[PDB]
Amino acid sequence: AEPALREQQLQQELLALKQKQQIQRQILIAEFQRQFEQLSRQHEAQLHEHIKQQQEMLAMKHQQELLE
Amino acid sequence: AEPALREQQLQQELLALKQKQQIQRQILIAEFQRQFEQLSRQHEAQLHEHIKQQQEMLAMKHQQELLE
Amino acid sequence: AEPALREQQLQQELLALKQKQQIQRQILIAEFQRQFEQLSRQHEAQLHEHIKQQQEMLAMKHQQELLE
Amino acid sequence: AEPALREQQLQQELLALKQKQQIQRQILIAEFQRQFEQLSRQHEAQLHEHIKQQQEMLAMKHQQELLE
């Protein structure tokens, strides 16, 4: 065979495309996933750090408010 | 004033944190947006490429097979 | 004509399929975008509400601590 | 004790807020993930459908161009 052989070439090429692409999309998503928890953990720590300092302020304002 | 000033500091820094982050998130998203249409246009072109070449195959398997 | 028409039809349809999908993807993304700032504003408010709470606590554990 | 208790309430209350949020985000993402492969499989199938038909056209065009 020759043409019907070339035919089988494509049908295999294609089905090789879908599988390839479906992996890629998953990489795209996992990639986002990571850059997502990353931001999230940063933003968070900050928001927390903040809380850890709005403490000491209200702290000093009344913890030292005894000798004052 | 002084403590009631240090108070005003934090109150302000916070409202800054929010605004910052609210933007960073938008950058994160726009970033994904791009890496998304990008993949999408690649994947597509390919899938279209396939369609372009699967043309000639079935073409020549019968356009040249007419002389055969 | 005849096939040259059914041929033009497909080329027509195809350029239409891309048009469509290219938009849908945008809807998918906008959709995520929204469910994203939404969560982000919730999570945030909470994290902020928590800031108001941890305030009054440190507050009263020392605000009326004068009468103690 | 008491304040040292109300303190402990929040300290734990907060460390609980993170847990919640940290998972909620994962639901948001998994959610997107699904709506993503879903669209992707749809769009794809269609794009392939087009192929299984741009075939028959060029097909019946010249396959029947033997009796013509």
Local structure of residue A63 (DSSP, 8 states) = H
Local structure of residue D1 (DSSP, 8 states) = -
Nearest CA in chain C to B52: C11
Give the domains, in start order, of chain B with CATH numbers: 1-68 (6.10.250.1550)
Chain A residues in contact with chain D using a Cβ-Cβ cutoff of 8 Å? 14, 18, 21-22, 25, 29, 32-33, 36-37, 40, 44, 48, 51
In this complex, the chains that touch C, judged by 3 or more CB pairs closer than 8 A, are A, B, D
Report CB contact under 8 Å: B33, C29: yes
Residue D67: helix, strand or coil by DSSP? Answer: coil
Interface test with chain A among B29, B31, B39, B68, by most A beta carbons within 10 Å: B39
Q: How many residues does the structure list for chain A?
A: 68
B59 neighbourhood in chain C, CB within 8 Å:
none
DSSP-assigned letters across all residues of C1-67? --HHHHHHHHHHHHHHHHHHHHHHHHHHHHHHHHHHHHHHHHHHHHHHHHHHHHHHHHHHHHHSGGG
CA dist., res. B22 & res. B28, Å (int): 10
List the single residue in D47, D54, D62 with the smallest CB-CB distance to B62: D62
List the single residue in A44, A51, A62 with the smallest CB-CB distance to C65: A62
DSSP3 helix / strand / coil % (chain B, rounded to 5): 90, 0, 10
Report yes or no: A6 and B57 within 8 Å, Cβ to Cβ: yes
Report yes or no: C54 and D13 within 8 Å, Cβ to Cβ: no
CA dist., res. B47 & res. A14, Å (int): 8
List the single residue in D54, D59, D65 with the smallest CB-CB distance to B51: D54
Give the closest-approach CA distance of B51 to chain D in angstroms.
6
